[PDB]
Ligand binder design. Structure first.
Ligand SMILES: Nc1ncnc2c1ncn2[C@@H]1O[C@H](COP(=O)(O)OP(=O)(O)OP(=O)(O)O)[C@@H](O)[C@H]1O
Ligand SMILES: [Mg+2]
Lengths: 480, 51, 55, 102, 153, 114, 145, 110, 52, 154, 48, 67, 160, 102, 48, 46
């Protein structure tokens, strides 16, 4: 066997170092003898029949890369995505497995759009025609498509080209967060401190280089500051001041900071700004929070006789619309009010909800798969519910699906997460790809799920039949 | 939520029609029915087992 | 437990988080006095009192 | 009949009215734009007009935190009580179960 | 009938009834007025009118087979898989148009529920005595329901 | 016809009104009761001939205001909100100079004592 | 081959658990090479709750016929006892039998591989009927002293 | 019993750890898996877990389950000699040290 | 097939919800399926009117 | 997590001998595979269990092979050896699952059921809100709050 | 066929060698060349 | 310069000509757009190369089967 | 199709917390509502325990009503719209017709003449188009007109 | 007249067989099922006219029905009913409308 | 068209009289303008 | 049972007496037979 003859090639990038020990994946990934004239004298070395997709920067991506795979380094992910990733997009890249992305056809279009945004001032007319006068793009499609992956790639493109980008990877933490607190200085407005504290910290470190050069245009110079801390004369220092406080003093610390940050950001008309908001459909309707009962802000002396029933029966009060949040107020103001031709919104419509069709019994507490997913049950239409130009994206075509499946199976088996020594216990690549197409319906979310469920397949006789044929041929050869 | 159900009179309407409550009262006149005043509006449940 | 759950329902600002995600101590554990600091308190209750497990 | 209806509140009909009355007292619009015609909040059920009543609960928590009792004694049906039990099925005549009366 | 088996004979009835269905004809009969459930509901479903075209890879494969390789991809119906003899090409080999609005049937849950409960409830709402010419249409109708202990009796 | 359909919810079906008179044991009396009730229902349904004030209203399911109209909620009294925000910030910082944590209940929200 | 000339739909019948599961399969070829399988008006994956070990045996008749699933549109109608979720091996077996019978009716020569692989064969096993003499009612007697 | 919400929380935690660069938990998990996940050597002829004697007049099911429970309680993972363990074993399937893991890719150059 | 029958010519009108009868004139039966699954109630017989 | 009742532990033989009902159930198997994949370690024991179990359930219906009868007993010894080897492989898989589940719960700050051990910060065993006023294994009383294995802030 | 897909062999004969072999073969043959054949040959020459 | 937007190889050019012919014929599903047809041909040749490498690796794997 | 369990498990021997077997009323089956039917601790059959919790019929009825409540709450979550009366003259053309009562006739279609095959009982109209008729005396349009996107427009999706 | 079918009335009576007055387990294990059956057939006649002669000839077949067989006669006949505004007029609604209290 | 309507439309009383003559449709008949003849149908079950 | 030893499994009838012989075991993989026969013919020719 071609096992001891193989030595690992020199490691150039993080992707090359994700190779499992040779003995484990020798069966899964066969090796072949490659001959070439190395410095005159020909040399014949054994090499793998498969290699990971090359890792290359977004500026190196081209038209020929459409419907192909490309990897991103671990250090690049750390410096580009401190806010996190999409809800279900990171589960395909465990720490050992290399981080890959599919350069979709829509990805190329958005890569070009971000490229124009780099210097939009020279091509304002070009971008206006692309957006058709709208303030950005909103991406909608069937549940489990690559809409969140598109947003992650967009943020990668923006940060690689050094454009200040406001990233909201999860809209659940804002609209359907843990608790909501009224705004400190904005009457009739609320905010979510749990999401705001993390958002400010991640946004600051994400755009540390860009925001450092920024200067405050509309910001009070006499804001409260504890001993040892310095008044923020820089936008990045303002962001740090927003979250560098001990609770409960941080609640109002972020409440004023988020409003001033939005106001200062809206007061910029030259530097391009890119906004990426995953799950924008949560920002256009009511939040799951409820307005407080009026008896809670009235004061009760004797509960037994106070003409109140808050402690008797629970009741439903109107829900807070997402437009009443301090964070969302800035975004709505930029979208509606004109005179802001440098803000570019790229938003997604998450459709991860608890299934419901007629009857709905109590889900099993253990086997539930949509338990963590939020539930709204409200039909959504981005064309009528958003000001951005709608982009309809469907499931993978078989070209993209084949590349996605090839990357998942082979890179995982090369990284040391596949069958490895048990390669003969799984069907061939074409048989697996054919089965996954039927099982998953060529759905990006279904592909990874059925790839994981591949081992539990019971009805697949190809390997047993192939073993039987090989044994029969070997016996005939021994007889001869 | 808790609310008081309004009743817009056809005379007060910009263009008069026949209100659903008026038609239901006519139905109760036609067939001798019983209007349960204390019937809650939040307990309208469909027997999904047999429906 | 009943009034605190009802007040959490009525206050809003939490939504379904008090039932879909929150959990509460059992019926006999939530009836302990203000300061207990001991598990065996529920068995120290008077037995000749016919209050049906209400201390 | 349960669930009991809690006492009404003035400005809990809509978020605009709630903000105008309980939050700032400076909100310009009194309430949401109300159509001149009648709006039936509980569409299937025709409730008595002028009567304060609730609507089926949107949230799950209130359903199990409300004062909703459970069945304790035997279940009584307005007509099936003649038939003693599911086991003791009292049939007056041996007619078909799919029989029609024209 | 030697054409189809029991289930096929039953189902071709529904197919023909939906083919000749007209909603204005249901005013007289009861359950008979209800058309084929699957076809009617999948027609009412608004998400089925958008039939996807043949996919890019299949189009390219058919092109490279018919034009470049001079051998078109035969549909499974017209493939002579009987090694014993040549079978004639059936009339439905490839001329049966495929549309998402007709087959396979996909319907909304609420539409299905409403159809089922309406069909159950509209049991006796049939005007037996009409002026239509033929078997249906009469002045008086008599039903003699004769009951005994034995089926042969 | 529409008024009659509204008046008779389940008694009509597929354009065929049906009334099962079961009041009396005698069919001779039951048919009399059925005819009387049918005539009464028809007379009460004929109100639509009198004028538009008896025409049954149409049940129309109007949608909640769409997201585009919802987004305008963030700009309600926008100039007044911006003007008030500066004063609220002044009060907030003045109270923060003396208290470690400041709540909106002492800045803008009002909670009556008793 | 027996099939309606007008629509080209082959009808097959499958049964499992005696009378608990009865399904009727309607099969038609798609000229567009786009093929979806539907059960009671819903996608097969949604019907079977995205269970690979159940959806594999529905595809198995096509693999044993050496055909392409994308060329056929299959609809499944459930008869007998209807349940909310039929994501169980017995119901999957019934669906497999119905699909195999429909494919056999559509294409005659497909009968040999399916019959030799046992796809068309019906198992007469069914759950033991209720009996109040048993403690649970099915298979366990009462306490003896 | 492990739930899908637990899986989602684990995915969020590992995403946070990867994005923050904390890899000590990953290294300790991988070392624990390397130590506990070795291929069991094939038992020699005559290796069979003992079975409880059978009697027909009166089968004591309580003793039947007691013997099994006690035997498996004694058969602790510590003394599982069949599963190779310790540093003397050679594992030609897993990386031996954290230095050669892909997170330390900066070292393997030229 | 080819059975001489005299059938009433139907008249097609959108104003009439139901079918319109007409003059009974000569016709030739092109085909008639006795199978109820090929022509359910009300069963039809395909005819050709020789006048036009 | 959601199961906080004191539980009874069945023998590993009793767990393994259950067929594709709980031990070999595809839903639980794929959940374990997902957990291993998210942790980034190879699923060799789980795959070695699955390859055995799918063949076992495939061949469960048929009859045992006819045998002439080995005088030396080599065939019976070989069959017993194979059965024991498969049982030990499944033992290793069971232990791997029951170890990594506890490790994941400890990492995720998930409070487990009564009378179970998490190698991180709870070695005696976790008892909280139990029907008995003591640990039931150390016979020591416990505070009214269950315990605080992890800090407060997340 | 020479440039439609990829050939698999125990000896991977190069595209240059196979194209030159075919060109010499058709040169040795006396076939009256056609526009499409020469166009295909020139297109193959276009990139190498 | 980056990469030229032209069919690089013989398969690329031939499938580009075929896509143009299909667009002229007006078959359903043909994108009849230049960039879309370029994406089509690039993806199809990529699929062909993937099939070729899978066929190359399967025969090497067959030699490594245990029995 | 729903993955939830609608059936109360039958009464049998005492269920112990283990693998494949959990207590019948361990705060997880049918949500937390099983506390209404939970009787913790060893209980004397002679003189302890409420019989309605031991009656299979009653507990099945209770779990049925709880499932019905779940279905109702989810349906009302879906029901984002509200119903407003209009006197048959300000409605669009698709509504100027006779609509049979619920569950009384064939499910009607929304004017199949112009290839519109929706369900008339499920069609929902937005407020923007009906703003004029709903608020005749409003004067200034309080709700802004709905800005429709032109499909014929040359946008980024059309491969500019 | 064409003859149609109808689902037979089948009723399964389940009862004990043992006479033991002590052993409830034996009584339950001795349970037996026996069912009563009543099969019906429906004859449909559609006369284009109402003739009393046919009714006379039809109602008088119960005399010569076969052994152990009964018959039911469903009659659906068109009947002219008179609707008049003299006793059921179409007037306006009352000046004071009736409420739920009535 | 008016001729067709005149020769094809029957009044309520005319239709009731025409059906009652030949088909023996039992039931009262009304000729006053305020009366209307509704040709409904009745269904009942007789068993002896 | 009734205070008696439980009979051995041989006395009980077949547990799978109600399934066809072709089901136990299934012979799936018929599509590969022609391919393997042609492969065998090709390699035998070589
Ligand atoms: N270009 C891509 N590169 C890598 N993975 C991708 C790509 N597109 C989609 N995926 C994968 O598809 C799956 C689902 O993608 P995604 O997270 O965008 O779903 P979604 O439609 O936004 O879901 P939800 O409704 O939960 O918000 C993930 O496993 C993700 O990794
Ligand atoms: Mg998403």
């Amino acid at each position: 066997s071609l096992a001891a003859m193989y030595m690992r090639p020199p490691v150039t990038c993080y992707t090359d170092a994700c190779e499992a020990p040779v003995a484990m994946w020798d069966g899964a990934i066969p090796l072949k003898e490659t001959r070439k004239l190395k410095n005159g004298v020909p040399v014949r070395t054994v090499s793998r029949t498969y290699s990971h997709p090359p890792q290359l920067t977004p500026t190196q991506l081209s038209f020929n890369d459409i419907n192909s795979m490309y990897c991103v380094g671990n250090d690049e992910l750390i410096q580009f995505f401190p806010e996190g990733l999409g809800g279900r997009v990171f589960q395909t890249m465990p720490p050992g497995h290399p981080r890959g992305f599919l350069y979709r056809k829509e990805t190329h279009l958005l890569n070009l759009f971000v490229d124009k945004v780099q210097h939009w001032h020279t091509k304002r007319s070009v971008l206006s025609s692309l957006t058709n006068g709208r303030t950005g793009f909103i991406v909608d499609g069937p549940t489990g498509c690559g809409k969140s992956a598109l947003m992650c790639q967009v943020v990668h493109f923006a940060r690689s080209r050094n454009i200040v980008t406001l990233y909201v990877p999860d809209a659940k933490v804002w609209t359907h967060g843990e608790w909501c607190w009224p705004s400190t200085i904005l009457p009739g407005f609320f905010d979510a401190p749990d999401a705001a504290r993390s958002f400010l910290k991640y946004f600051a470190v994400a755009n540390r280089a860009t925001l450092t050069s920024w200067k405050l245009r509309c910001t009070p110079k006499d804001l409260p500051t504890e001993q040892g801390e310095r008044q923020p004369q820089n936008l990045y220092e303002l962001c740090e001041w927003g979250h560098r406080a001990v609770a409960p003093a941080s609640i109002d610390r972020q409440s004023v900071c988020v409003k001033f940050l939005m106001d200062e950001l809206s007061e910029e008309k030259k530097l391009p700004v890119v906004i990426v908001v995953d799950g924008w459909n949560l920002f256009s309707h009511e939040t799951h929070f409820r307005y407080p009962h009026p008896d809670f802000l009235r004061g009760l002396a004797s509960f037994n006789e106070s003409s109140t029933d808050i402690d008797l029966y629970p009741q439903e009060l109107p829900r807070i619309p997402a437009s009443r949040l301090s964070f969302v107020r800035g975004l709505n103001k930029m979208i509606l009010s004109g005179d802001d031709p440098n803000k570019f919104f790229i938003t997604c419509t998450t459709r991860d909800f608890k299934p419901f069709d007629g009857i709905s019994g109590f889900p099993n507490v253990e086997t539930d798969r949509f338990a963590n997913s939020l539930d709204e049950y409200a039909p959504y239409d981005p064309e009528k519910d958003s000001h951005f130009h709608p982009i309809q994206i469907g499931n993978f075509d078989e070209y993209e699906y084949r590349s996605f499946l090839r990357f998942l199976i082979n890179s995982g088996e090369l990284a040391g997460l596949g069958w490895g020594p048990l390669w003969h216990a799984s069907s061939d690549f074409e048989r697996k790809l054919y089965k996954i197409g039927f099982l998953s319906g060529r759905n990006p979310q279904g592909v990874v799920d059925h790839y994981h469920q591949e081992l539990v397949w019971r009805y697949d006789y190809q390997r047993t039949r192939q073993k039987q044929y090989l044994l029969k041929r070997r016996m005939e050869g021994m007889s001869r | 939520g808790v609310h008081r159900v309004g009743y817009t009179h056809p005379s007060t309407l910009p263009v008069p029609c026949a209100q659903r409550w008026d038609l239901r009262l006519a139905r109760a006149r036609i067939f001798q029915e019983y209007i349960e005043e204390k019937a809650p509006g939040a307990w309208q449940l469909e027997d999904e087992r047999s429906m | 437990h009943r009034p605190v759950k009802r007040l959490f329902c009525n206050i809003g600002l939490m939504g379904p988080q008090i039932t879909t995600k929150a959990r509460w101590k059992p019926y006999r554990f939530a009836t302990n006095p203000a300061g207990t600091s001991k598990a065996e308190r529920m068995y120290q209750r008077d037995k000749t009192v016919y209050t049906h497990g209400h201390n | 009949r349960f669930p009991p209806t809690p006492s009404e509140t003035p400005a809990t009909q809509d978020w605009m009215a709630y903000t105008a009355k309980y939050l700032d007292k400076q909100f310009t619009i009194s309430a949401e734009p109300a159509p001149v015609y009648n709006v039936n909040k509980l569409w299937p059920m025709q409730q008595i007009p002028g009567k304060v009543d609730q609507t089926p609960f949107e949230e799950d928590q209130t359903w199990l935190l409300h004062s909703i009792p459970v069945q304790q004694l035997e279940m009584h049906h307005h007509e099936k009580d003649l038939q003693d039990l599911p086991f003791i099925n009292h049939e007056q005549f041996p007619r078909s179960l799919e029989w029609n009366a024209p | 009938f030697n054409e189809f088996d029991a289930k096929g004979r039953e189902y071709v009835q529904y197919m023909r009834e939906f083919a000749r269905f007209d909603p204005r004809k249901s005013r007289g009969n009861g359950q008979k007025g209800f058309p084929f459930r699957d076809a009617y509901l999948t027609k009412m479903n608004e998400a089925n009118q958008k039939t996807p075209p043949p996919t890019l890879e299949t189009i390219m494969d058919r092109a490279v087979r018919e034009h470049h390789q001079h051998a078109r991809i035969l549909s499974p119906l017209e493939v002579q898989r009987d090694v014993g003899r040549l079978e004639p090409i059936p009339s439905y080999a490839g001329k049966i148009n495929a549309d998402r609005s007709v087959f396979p049937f996909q319907w909304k849950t609420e539409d299905w529920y409403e159809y089922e409960v309406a069909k159950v409830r509209n049991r006796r709402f049939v005007f037996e005595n009409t002026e239509e010419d033929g078997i249906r249409g009469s002045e008086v109708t008599y039903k003699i329901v004769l009951e005994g202990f034995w089926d042969h009796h | 016809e529409r008024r009659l359909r509204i008046l008779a919810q389940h008694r009509v079906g597929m354009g065929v009104l049906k009334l099962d008179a079961d009041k009396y044991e005698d069919q001779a009396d039951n048919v009399t009761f059925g005819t009387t009730k049918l005539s009464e229902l028809l007379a009460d349904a004929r109100k639509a001939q009198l004028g538009e004030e008896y025409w049954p209203s149409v049940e129309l399911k109007v949608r909640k205001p769409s997201g585009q109209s919802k987004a305008h909620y963030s700009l309600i009294d926008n100039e007044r909100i911006e003007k008030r925000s500066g004063e609220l910030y002044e009060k907030y910082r003045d109270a923060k100079k003396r208290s470690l944590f400041v709540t909106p209940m002492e800045t803008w929200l009002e909670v009556k004592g008793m | 081959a027996e099939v309606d000339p007008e629509t080209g739909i082959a009808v097959g019948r499958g049964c499992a658990d005696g009378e608990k599961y009865h399904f009727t399969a309607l099969l038609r070829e798609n000229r567009d090479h786009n093929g979806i399988i539907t059960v009671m008006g819903k996608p097969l994956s949604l019907v079977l709750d995205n269970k690979a070990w159940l959806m594999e045996m529905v595809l198995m008749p096509f693999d044993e016929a050496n055909l392409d699933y994308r060329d056929f549109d299959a609809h499944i109608v459930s008869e007998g006892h209807a349940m909310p979720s039929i994501a169980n091996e017995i119901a999957a077996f019934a669906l497999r039998m119905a699909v195999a019978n429909a494919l056999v009716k559509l294409i005659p020569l497909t009968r040999i591989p399916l019959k030799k692989s046992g796809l068309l064969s019906v198992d007469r096993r069914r759950e033991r009927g209720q009996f109040p003499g048993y403690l649970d009612g099915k298979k366990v007697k009462r306490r003896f002293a | 019993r492990l739930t899908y919400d637990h899986l989602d929380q684990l995915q969020q935690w590992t995403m946070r750890a990867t994005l923050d660069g904390r890899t000590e938990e990953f290294n300790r998990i991988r070392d624990l898996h390397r130590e506990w996940s070795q291929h069991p050597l094939m038992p020699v002829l005559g290796d069979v877990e003992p079975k409880f004697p059978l009697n027909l007049f009166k089968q004591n099911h309580r003793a039947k389950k007691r013997f099994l429970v006690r035997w498996h309680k004694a058969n602790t993972p510590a003394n599982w000699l069949w599963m190779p363990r310790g540093p003397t074993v050679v594992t030609p399937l897993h990386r031996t040290n954290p230095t050669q893991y892909p997170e330390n890719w900066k070292q393997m150059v030229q | 097939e080819g059975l001489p029958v005299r059938a009433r010519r139907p008249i097609f009108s959108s104003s009439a919800e139901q079918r319109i009868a007409g003059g009974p004139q000569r016709a030739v039966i092109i085909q008639y399926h006795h199978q109820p699954f090929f022509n359910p109630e009300p069963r039809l017989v395909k005819v050709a009117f020789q006048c036009d | 997590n959601t199961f906080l009742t004191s539980s009874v532990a069945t023998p590993p033989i009793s767990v393994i001998r259950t067929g594709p009902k709980w031990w070999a159930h595809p839903e639980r198997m794929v959940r374990q595979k997902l957990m291993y994949f998210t942790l980034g370690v190879d699923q060799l024991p789980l795959r070695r269990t699955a390859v055995i179990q799918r063949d076992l359930q495939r061949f469960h219906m048929c009859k045992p092979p006819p045998r002439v009868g080995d005088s030396t007993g080599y065939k019976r010894s070989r069959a017993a050896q194979l059965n024991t080897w498969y049982r030990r492989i499944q033992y290793q898989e069971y232990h791997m699952q029951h170890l990594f589940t506890r490790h994941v719960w400890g990492l995720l700050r998930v409070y487990p059921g009564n009378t179970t051990k998490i190698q991180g910060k709870a070695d005696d065993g976790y008892v909280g809100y139990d029907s008995v006023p003591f640990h039931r294994y150390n016979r020591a009383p416990l505070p009214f709050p269950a315990r605080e294995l992890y800090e407060r802030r997340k | 066929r020479m440039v439609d897909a990829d050939f698999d062999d125990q000896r991977p004969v190069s595209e240059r060698r196979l194209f030159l072999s075919l060109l010499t073969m058709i040169s040795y043959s006396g076939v009256l060349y056609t526009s499409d054949l020469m166009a295909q040959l020139m297109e193959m020459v276009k990139y190498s | 310069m980056q990469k030229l937007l032209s069919p690089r190889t013989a398969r690329h050019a031939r499938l580009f000509r075929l896509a143009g012919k299909l667009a002229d014929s007006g078959s359903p599903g043909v994108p009849k757009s230049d960039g879309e047809r370029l994406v089509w041909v690039n993806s199809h040749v990529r699929r062909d190369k993937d099939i070729s490498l899978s066929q190359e690796e399967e025969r090497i794997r067959e030699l490594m089967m245990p029995l | 199709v729903s993955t939830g369990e609608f059936d109360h498990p039958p009464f049998q021997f005492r269920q112990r917390h283990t693998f494949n077997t959990t207590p019948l009323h361990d705060a997880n089956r049918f949500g937390g509502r099983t506390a209404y039917l939970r009787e913790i601790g060893p209980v004397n059959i002679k003189k302890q325990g409420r019989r309605f919790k031991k009656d299979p019929r009653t507990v099945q009825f209770n779990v049925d009503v709880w499932c019905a409540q779940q279905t109702l709450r989810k349906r009302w979550k879906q029901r984002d719209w509200e119903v407003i009366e209009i006197p048959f003259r300000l409605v669009p053309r698709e509504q100027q017709r006779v609509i049979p009562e619920l569950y009384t006739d064939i499910p009607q279609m929304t004017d199949p003449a112009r290839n519109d095959f929706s369900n008339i009982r499920n069609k929902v109209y937005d407020r923007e188009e009906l703003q004029g008729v709903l608020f005749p005396a409003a004067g200034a349009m309080l709700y802004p007109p709905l800005q429709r996107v032109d499909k014929q427009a040359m946008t980024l999706d059309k491969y500019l | 007249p064409h003859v149609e079918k109808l689902e037979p009335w089948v009723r399964m009576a389940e009862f004990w067989t043992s006479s033991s007055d002590t052993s409830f387990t034996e009584l339950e294990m001795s349970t037996a099922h026996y069912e009563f059956r009543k099969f019906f057939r429906v004859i449909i006649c559609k006369l284009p006219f109402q003739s009393t002669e046919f009714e006379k000839r039809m109602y008088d077949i119960r005399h010569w029905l076969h052994r152990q067989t009964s018959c039911e006669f469903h009659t659906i006949y068109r009947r002219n009913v008179i609707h008049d505004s003299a006793v059921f007029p179409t007037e306006h609604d009352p000046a004071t409308p009736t409420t739920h209290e009535h | 068209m008016h001729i067709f309507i005149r020769l094809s439309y029957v009044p309520h009383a005319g239709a009731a009289t025409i059906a009652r003559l030949s088909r023996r449709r039992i039931g009262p008949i009304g000729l006053e303008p305020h009366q209307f003849n509704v040709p409904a149908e009745l269904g009942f079950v007789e068993q002896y | 049972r009734r205070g008696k030893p439980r009979p051995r499994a041989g006395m009980f009838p077949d547990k799978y007496r109600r399934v066809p012989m072709l089901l136990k075991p299934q012979q799936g993989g018929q599509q590969y037979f022609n391919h393997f026969l042609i492969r065998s013919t090709n390699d035998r020719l070589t």
